[PDB]
Ligand binder design. Structure first.
Ligand SMILES: [Mg+2]
Ligand SMILES: [Mg+2]
Ligand SMILES: [Mg+2]
Ligand SMILES: [Mg+2]
Ligand SMILES: [Mg+2]
Ligand SMILES: [Mg+2]
Ligand SMILES: [Mg+2]
Ligand SMILES: [Mg+2]
Lengths: 69, 145, 63, 107, 67, 141, 80, 206, 141
RNA sequence: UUAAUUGCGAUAACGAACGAGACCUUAACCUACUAAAUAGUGGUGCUAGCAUUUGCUGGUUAUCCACUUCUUAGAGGGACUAUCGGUUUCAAGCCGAUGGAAGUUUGAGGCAAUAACAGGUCUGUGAUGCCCUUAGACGUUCUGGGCCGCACGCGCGCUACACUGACGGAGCCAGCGAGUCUAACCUUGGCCGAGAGGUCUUGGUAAUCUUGUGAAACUCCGUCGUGCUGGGGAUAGAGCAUUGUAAUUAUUGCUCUUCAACGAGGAAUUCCUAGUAAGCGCAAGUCAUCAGCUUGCGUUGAUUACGUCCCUGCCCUUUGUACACAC
């Protein structure tokens, strides 16, 4: 039921919609999107190292991520 | 400790050992649907096959799907210490047999049908289907078995 | 709805079948000298400002 | 024997605490009058022996439970004493119901 | 649940009856007075008896107390 | 700039020391690692099969450093937990004896610990020297 | 032998010891004394001996199949 | 303001807390006046605490729990459904995430958001059962401010609890959206709908 | 001689002993810095005895804390009291009364548990019930 | 009015006694006394290791000195609702604020009056009346089985239905106990074994050693991602061990393997007001072994109310009674 595997036609759904998201976490990347929870955690940690989204507090079982600047 | 990006060379549902196995879920917990294969056995089989456990059981390749089955049907040859198996010290030929999908019910059927022929108590209770491990049937098990 | 305020100035006594309701003497913050008696459910003391959606109503279950 | 220390240890234990206190005060009392170097009476934690039993002999009634307490109080004193002085005070006038142990340490 | 019993009250009245000049308006010295003008078999009962005695004296200063 | 292994975060130090011994490549893993549940109270093998022994070694080496001397039995209770006994309630049972014994023997060969005739194993000279180095690089990096 | 020796001694004021009185309260009935007279004898003896109070309870069946308890008290007693 | 040096090192972010006693590190209780009247002296302000963990005594006097801080009271209601009884360190972690979500949304103070959500949640009137038997009537009554703030916390916490139950949404997430909707007033949150439900039963059984 | 005061702080079963001596601002509990106290959710449970009167009042104070008993959060409540009590005791013996009173007023005006032990104590469990007040379930049928 | 027949008062009653209370045990405080190598701390006669110009840590008390803050236990001290304000017939009292270790009878128990019950126990007693049996015994002993048997109904419980979670690693903190020469009790440390456990030894008749019982829930970092699913562990099979003379009707422990019901529970119903409820374990009891039970202990620690007679039960007054074996 959920896109557990990311591909190109799903990849553009993340990279064009993660800007303007005030709140970014594992549950909002599966509610708004269709990708699974495990890949959502992969997407969040991937999108931090380049730096298009910012961290507010790093904890397990919950994340708090917002835009840049 | 790091996580690398991956691309979707995904494949559809698949069939192993005459049993449907779904994709979309991790490889170790996908082989658990095979009868006679549990979480511990499927975890051992994968690491013996030297595969990534984050491979979702649907983006693997035919070479490592052939590899996991060979280890699964031949435990001892792939460094399995014989205390990890389903049936240990077989009553017939004294070998350590790990039982697989379609053979778990048949071997279990043979074992119970043995004790019925033997007229042993653990099989006698199976003939009526009652509790065979000595649990009290005073106020319990009023729906099945 | 322009709900009006009111300040409790006296705890008359405890009322109600099960005793969970308290009866108080309360005046009005706007248009003072309008003092009326109500039936309050929660724990209350003096000077407790509470809002009455209607003011033309006096307590009936008393004593 | 010619005024040689023995390094004695006297340990007192009994349930009846009150008269054990008097003897612990007695044993410390006969030391300064003989100018005896000592380590004071060390009091040890009370061991509250407890028994939890049903009041009833049968099984009938509300399940009521009693706790019995046999308190025992243990004390000990280290005395740097002569051989003569300890013997004629501890072999005589022993209090009733209180257990006393006289042991020797030579570390 | 702090209503003093007859043992506290009757001893306090009997104490004020015959010891009013000796007593004061301070429980801290009233409790010391109790041990040396009366026999109380516990410290808690003495504090109760002396405490109500001070409460009695505080009432005696502003108007008489019947009994 | 005096440093010991008490000023460093506890969780981070096992991470740093395990990585160091992972890069050192001389801890002589007993080879039955990837198959043992590392406690009878466990139900699954350690997720990080390649490095769990190095983290366990880092935790054990830290515990010998901060204490006086620790044997096998104290380590078994240390890493034990609550075992889900199924229908019956939980209970505490000790960790795996063989692994907790061989991690000490692995640290014995590297000389992280001594023999300590007064009981279990105590920290060794060269053992606490390298612990302080990793403790120094963590706080100063 | 010699490590333990008995020392029999007499008892002062027997009337202020329930164990001694209850025993004598029993042998009198075994000698055929009336239950009321024996019980009234014990409490009177205990009171003249110097006790503040006494309380004798005789429970069981007497002169009837039904059992009943008799209380013979005098003086002042407490219970708690 | 000015730095100080000690034998033990101390971070700068925690070293700045001496001039202003805030929450954990971020939100300050200054300028968080309760703009809705009739609830002050029952929602506690102007006496800040760093963390919402306090082993205080609030169940010995009748009204002592009003003096208890508002953030402390909200955490106390997350320790519900048996399995979560005790476990207060877990609930403090939940609210810290919850106020962070309010800060990545809703640029105003999360302390003001939860305060303004309490005022919009408490049922101003309620209803009590009058009658000596089961088949009885119902009578309308007005609610004291203490019960209102008590019911305000209860209406948010249970409805934000069953939302997270059997759902991918975390409890901090469900509470965060429940608080912002209740602050503005949306009628799409469990707390606001229950308040209107209770208040209109009172308007009927008057 | 070194001017030192020795104090303590008590939660339910947790007791922390604090040795307060002259120096340069060393704040160590169990040989570990006050920035290393665990869990981190309660770092700000032992920071307010330092963060309310001002960290400048530790430029000549060395605090050594050893704690045992209680639990994870009983200990942090026992630790936070011993340091606050130890600071007042040190300021009572070597500092003027004005400074000690300003500490005393500040601690009292914020939280009385910085200096006064939590008088709540565990209550004995009773027969016929799982806890002190709770009883076993009766049925009547 | 009080928890109280607790008191203030009223008063053909007055002065009393038991009960209640007072009392006892225990918890909370004591930088005040007595002290301590079976408790701890600090300097160091002796010092040592690491990193640097002193922080962490390991040993000796004729291979040291000093002390009791923390621990202990003796003597005691301390709280009496103290002070203030309000209310009350300005009485007993009650409420709020201040101070205090403690202001719920300071918390919790021990004991507990009169009169009873055809309440339970003759299956605890070498306590016992009467009756029965007493050699082919209803005495005692031995062998084996049964109390656990399973269409069903009811009660006390344990584990859950999941993300406030399961699992992995790491961090890692209690208290009440018990324990062997009248031989195997608690068991440390070393070795072997996946594990259970086996083995070589050490300590403790115990503030010394098991044991800082390094308990669990909990905390962090990760895997899982709303899927009867990695929830849940019922049922069932194979094997490896321990206890016992004996494990089959599986004592129990462990390993692999099947992954059943159950998606928050109808009618109804239990307990509970602050370190309390609830969660979480630990000890002890029984015990050769086995707890899902009990008695205690500690860890984490709410919501709500400081009230009423609506239901239920009890007590009292008035009233009615053809009831008194008492509706
Ligand atoms: Mg009396
Ligand atoms: Mg009376
Ligand atoms: Mg039976
Ligand atoms: Mg301990
Ligand atoms: Mg499971
Ligand atoms: Mg399943
Ligand atoms: Mg039983
Ligand atoms: Mg009539």
């Amino acid at each position: 039921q959920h896109a557990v595997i990311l591909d190109q036609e799903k990849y553009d759904r993340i990279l064009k919609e993660v800007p303007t998201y005030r709140y970014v976490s594992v549950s909002v990347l599966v509610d708004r999107l269709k990708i699974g929870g495990s890949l959502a955690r992969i997407a969040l940690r991937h999108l931090e190292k380049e730096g298009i989204i910012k961290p507010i507090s790093k904890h397990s079982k919950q994340a708090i991520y917002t835009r840049a600047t | 400790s790091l996580v690398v990006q991956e691309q979707g060379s995904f494949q559809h549902i698949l069939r192993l050992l005459n049993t449907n196995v779904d994709g979309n879920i991790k490889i170790v917990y996908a082989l658990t649907t095979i009868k006679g294969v549990g979480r511990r056995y499927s975890n051992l089989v994968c690491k013996k096959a030297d595969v990534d456990l984050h491979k979702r059981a649907g983006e693997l390749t035919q070479e490592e799907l052939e590899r996991i089955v060979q280890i699964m049907q031949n435990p001892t040859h792939y460094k399995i210490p014989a205390w990890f198996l389903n049936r240990q010290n077989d009553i017939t030929d004294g070998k350590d047999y790990h039982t697989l999908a379609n053979n778990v019910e048949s071997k279990l059927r043979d074992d119970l049908e043995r004790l019925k022929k033997i007229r042993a108590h653990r099989g006698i209770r199976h003939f009526w289907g009652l509790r065979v491990r000595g649990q009290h049937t005073k106020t319990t098990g009023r729906r099945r078995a | 709805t322009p709900v009006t305020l009111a300040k409790v100035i006296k705890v008359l006594g405890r009322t109600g079948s099960r005793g969970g309701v308290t009866q108080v003497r309360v005046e009005f913050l706007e248009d003072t000298s309008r003092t009326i008696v109500r039936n309050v459910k929660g724990p209350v003391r003096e000077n407790d400002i509470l809002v009455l959606m209607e003011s033309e109503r006096e307590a009936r279950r008393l004593r | 024997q010619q005024q040689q220390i023995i390094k004695i240890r006297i340990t007192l234990t009994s349930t009846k605490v009150k008269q054990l206190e008097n003897v612990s005060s007695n044993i410390v009392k006969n030391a300064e009058q003989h100018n005896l170097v000592k380590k004071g009476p060390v009091r040890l934690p009370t061991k509250v022996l407890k028994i939890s039993t049903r009041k009833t002999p049968n099984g009938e009634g509300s399940k009521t439970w009693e706790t019995y307490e046999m308190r025992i109080h243990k004390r000990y004193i280290d005395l740097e004493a002569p051989v003569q002085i300890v013997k004629r005070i501890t072999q005589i006038t022993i209090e009733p119901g209180v257990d006393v142990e006289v042991v020797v340490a030579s570390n | 649940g702090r209503v003093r019993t007859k043992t506290v009250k009757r001893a306090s009245k009997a104490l004020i009856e015959r010891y009013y000049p000796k007593l004061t308006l301070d429980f801290q010295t009233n409790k010391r007075l109790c041990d040396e003008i009366a026999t109380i078999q516990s410290k808690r009962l003495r504090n109760k008896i002396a405490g109500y005695t001070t409460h009695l004296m505080k009432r005696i200063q502003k108007g008489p107390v019947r009994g | 700039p005096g440093v010991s292994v008490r000023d460093v975060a506890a969780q981070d130090f096992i991470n740093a020391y395990a990585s160091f011994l992972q890069r050192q490549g001389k801890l002589e893993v007993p080879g039955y690692v990837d198959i043992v549940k590392t406690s009878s109270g466990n139900e699954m093998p350690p997720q990080d099969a390649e490095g769990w022994f190095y983290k366990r070694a880092a935790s054990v080496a830290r515990h010998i450093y901060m204490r006086k001397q620790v044997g096998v039995g104290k380590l078994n209770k240390l890493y034990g937990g609550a075992k889900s006994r199924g229908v019956r309630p939980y209970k505490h049972i000790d960790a795996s004896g063989s692994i907790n014994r061989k991690v000490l023997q692995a640290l014995e060969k590297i000389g992280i610990v001594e023999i300590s005739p007064k009981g279990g194993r105590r920290i060794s000279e060269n053992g606490q020297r390298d612990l302080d180095r990793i403790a120094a690089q963590t706080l100063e990096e | 032998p010699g490590t333990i020796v008995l020392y029999a001694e007499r008892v002062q004021d027997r009337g202020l010891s329930a164990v001694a009185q209850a025993e004598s309260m029993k042998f009198k009935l075994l000698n055929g004394l009336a239950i009321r007279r024996a019980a009234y004898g014990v409490v009177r003896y205990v009171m003249e001996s110097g006790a503040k109070g006494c309380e004798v309870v005789v429970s069981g069946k007497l002169r009837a199949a039904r059992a009943k308890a008799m209380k013979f008290a005098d003086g002042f007693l407490i219970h708690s | 303001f000015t730095p100080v040096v000690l034998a033990t090192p101390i971070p700068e972010e925690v070293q700045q807390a001496q001039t202003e006693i805030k929450l954990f590190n971020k939100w300050s209780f200054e300028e968080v006046e309760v703009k809705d009247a009739s609830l002050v002296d029952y929602v506690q302000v102007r006496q800040p605490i760093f963390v919402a963990h306090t082993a205080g005594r609030y169940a010995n006097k009748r009204f002592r729990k009003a003096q208890c801080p508002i953030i402390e009271r909200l955490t106390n209601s997350l320790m519900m459904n048996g399995r979560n009884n005790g476990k207060k360190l877990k609930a403090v972690r939940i609210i810290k995430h919850t106020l962070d979500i309010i800060n990545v949304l809703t640029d105003q103070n999360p302390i003001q958001v939860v305060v303004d959500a309490i005022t919009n949640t408490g049922p101003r009137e309620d209803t009590t059962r009058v009658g000596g038997g089961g088949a009885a009537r119902r009578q309308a009554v007005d609610v004291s401010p203490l019960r209102r703030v008590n019911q305000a916390i209860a209406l948010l916490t249970i409805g934000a609890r069953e939302a997270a139950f059997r759902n991918i949404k975390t409890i901090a997430e469900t509470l965060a959206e429940e608080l912002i909707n209740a602050a503005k007033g949306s009628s799409t949150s469990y707390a606001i709908k229950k308040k209107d439900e209770l208040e209109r039963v009172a308007k009927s059984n008057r | 001689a070194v001017p030192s005061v020795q104090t303590f702080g008590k939660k339910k079963s947790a007791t922390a002993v604090a040795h307060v001596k002259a120096g340069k601002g060393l704040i160590k509990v169990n040989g570990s810095p006050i920035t290393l106290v665990e869990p981190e959710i309660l770092r700000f449970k032992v920071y307010e005895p330092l963060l309310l009167v001002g960290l400048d009042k530790f430029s000549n104070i060395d605090i050594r804390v050893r704690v045992t008993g209680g639990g994870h959060v009983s200990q942090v409540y026992a630790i936070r009291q011993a340091i606050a009590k130890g600071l007042v005791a040190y300021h009572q013996k070597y500092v003027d009364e004005q400074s000690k009173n300003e500490l005393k007023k500040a601690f009292t005006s914020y939280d009385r548990t910085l200096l006064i032990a939590d008088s709540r104590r565990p209550e004995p469990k009773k027969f016929g019930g799982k806890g002190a007040r709770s009883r076993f379930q009766k049925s009547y049928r």
